[PDB]
Paper text:
The enzyme phospho­triesterase (PTE) is capable of hydrolyzing such OP compounds. Accordingly, it has been characterized from a number of bacterial sources, including Brevundimonas diminuta (Bd; formerly Pseudomonas diminuta), Flavobacterium spp. and Agrobacterium radiobacter. The present study focuses on Bd_PTE, a dimeric metallohydrolase that has a (β/α)8 TIM-barrel fold with two Zn2+ ions embedded in the active site. Carbon dioxide reacts with the side chain of Lys169 to form a carbamate functional group within the active site, which serves as a bridging ligand to the α-Zn2+ and β-Zn2+ ions, both of which are required for full catalytic activity. The buried α-Zn2+ ion is ligated to the protein via direct interactions with His55, His57 and Asp301, and the exposed β-Zn2+ ion interacts with His201 and His230.
Indeed, in the PTE variants studied, OP hydrolysis products could only be observed in the active site when co-crystallization was the method adopted, and only in crystals obtained from AS and glycerol in space group P43212. However, in the case of the three crystal structures of methylphosphonic acid (A53-5, C23-3 and C23M-2) the same methyl group is oriented in a different direction, into a space defined by His57, Ile106, Trp131, Asp301 and Leu303. Only when the PTE variants and the OPs are co-crystallized from AS with glycerol in space group P43212 can the OP ligands displace the cyclic compounds X3B or X3T that were initially observed in the apo structures. Thus, electron density corresponding to methylphosphonate was observed in the active sites of the three PTE variants A53, C23 and C23M.
Residue numbers in the entry:
A (entry chain A), B (entry chain A): 34 to 361
The structure:
């Protein structure tokens, strides 16, 4: 209630500080890093790259990241703890399910899924004792029958524990509207939910319809852009053709509409990425060499020059994540 | 070449003895047993159930099982080693990919997949040092583009190492024909391939077309039957409405056609099964309380009473698996 669970234990709300609410140490699949570490060069190479990136983010002012990798995104909390220890950056781990649940998850009931999410929040992840501080869910268009169960189980786990929910959307398909409907049918407060990848769309009617009913809006992929890589079909499909400035200006748009307290900003960066095409991490790193430091080093000064007060940006990067993550 | 790799190290061909060539300790998904052991009651309960079942199989004459669980079927070779040690039954582990590859596998090239399979055969699975003795692959109808890559990578790994390939089919769709075509396009000898779940069909033209060109025929689900459970839709979809006697008589049919040296027989049993509906293991155990001992306790005497000589059944259960598994 007055503590947020991290991969190194509980921290006070004050300790979280500048917080990136949607990040990944490694976007993978369950068991994959253990079974095929050479895909990333080596496990040690992945750790070192992550520690260097988090250290640079910490020098730019970041104090906490929320790693929203789930079980099926290959979340390895022992890896997160090692990297968090070495970089002196808090890492909040996630439960929930992302875009790639295996059969052993896809065949489960809403009650079974709730047990699993509660296990990772209340007891621990695997045998590590590390407890999730957030629940991650996903749709990519209209929800599959199973995804409806996942969203309902996430609501039930959140209602039992006060831990918030954050989502993956196909933003241009307005997924947040169906996600909101399911969450609200289970009695979940919108104040406990971040509708993520919302910077993937320019539709202000969709974004303000979510914000008006109390949802937090995840503008979490600001440096994702393939402008300058139209040659590259896979990178264009993943990153889009909208500039980082266009994405960042949605932060100002929601501020100007009165929603500054409901905005959560992040990079959605990673240090390894096996769940997409080979060498995508190299392509992404050439687009954005600042990595997770892109928000404080480039987005914050950009919004300042566009006239957003520093106090407003401090509220967005410090106050909003603390209010969101604090169990309630 | 003169050794078969098991989860406890290499064994001589003579040590394999009576061998069940298609079995599972636990049909699951990667990482699932680690993340949610309570699904199986407990990890300790799963181990104990498996040790009891293997001990009963050993008392019935079984000396070796081939666990054809892949990475994506949740193969845990440390679990296999513990159960193999406690029951004094050799267990051969598998590499390859089954019906549920995650994104981090599905996006890989044929070259990358070959590296992964070779890793598990030549170096070891995860950090355990345990090496696979067989490569498992799967189609369920016409092969997906990715499944074509898996089959080709399996052929390449087999050609480099001499380790055999065994397959999952939708037998009534005659999957073995396309599997054979892809394998042969890569230069793989049919003598290194078992076309599995072949007892799911009664089509003798399909079965003899595979056997005639040299494939081994996996009659591996003999006790799978939902006769007596027409009420149960999920069990009927999984197990089928053909009797175990009907499946077992395919063994005699292929013997009578001259293929006794190409028949491999098994139960396709499991001690846990999270990749299907909840409580399926209870349903399956009520259908077949003998578990993995069903082949020696019921199928062998049944074929004897139908006139198959004991020497022929000994060739099928001892000689054929040794010839198949011996790297060449
Ligand atoms: Zn996402
Ligand atoms: Zn993400
Ligand atoms: Zn199968
Ligand atoms: Zn099987």
């Amino acid at each position: 209630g007055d503590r947020i669970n991290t991969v190194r234990g509980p921290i006070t709300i004050s300790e979280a500080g500048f917080t990136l609410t949607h990040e990944h140490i490694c976007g993978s699949s369950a068991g994959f890093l253990r079974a095929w570490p050479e895909f990333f060069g080596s496990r040690a190479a992945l750790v070192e790259k992550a520690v260097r990136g988090l250290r640079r983010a910490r020098a730019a002012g970041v104090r906490t990241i929320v790693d929203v990798s789930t079980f099926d995104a290959g979340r390895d909390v022992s890896l997160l703890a090692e990297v968090s220890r070495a970089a002196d950056v808090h890492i909040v781990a996630a439960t929930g399910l992302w875009e790639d649940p295996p059969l052993s998850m896809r065949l489960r009931s809403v009650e079974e899924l709730t047990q699993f999410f509660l296990r990772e929040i209340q007891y621990g992840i695997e045998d590590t004792g590390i407890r999730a501080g957030i629940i991650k869910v996903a749709t990519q268009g209209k929800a599959t029958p199973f995804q409806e169960l996942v969203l309902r189980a996430a609501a039930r786990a959140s209602l039992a524990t006060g831990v918030p929910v954050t989502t993956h959307t196909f933003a241009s398909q307005r997924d947040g509207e169906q996600q909101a409907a399911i969450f609200e049918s289970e009695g979940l407060s919108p104040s406990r939910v971040c509708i993520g990848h919302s910077d993937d769309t320019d539709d202000l009617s969709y974004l303000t319809a979510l914000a008006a009913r109390g949802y937090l809006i995840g503008l979490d992929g600001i440096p994702h852009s393939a402008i300058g890589l139209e040659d590259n079909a896979s990178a264009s499909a993943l990153l889009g053709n909208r500039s980082w400035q266009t994405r960042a200006l949605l932060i100002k748009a929601l501020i100007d509409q009165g929603y500054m307290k409901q905005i959560l900003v992040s990079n959605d960066w990673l240090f390894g990425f096996s769940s997409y095409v080979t060498n995508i991490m190299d392509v992404m790193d050439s687009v954005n060499p600042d990595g997770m430091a892109f928000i404080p080093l480039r987005v914050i000064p950009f919004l300042r020059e566009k006239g957003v007060p520093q106090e407003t940006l401090a509220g967005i990067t410090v106050t909003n994540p603390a209010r969101f993550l604090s169990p309630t």
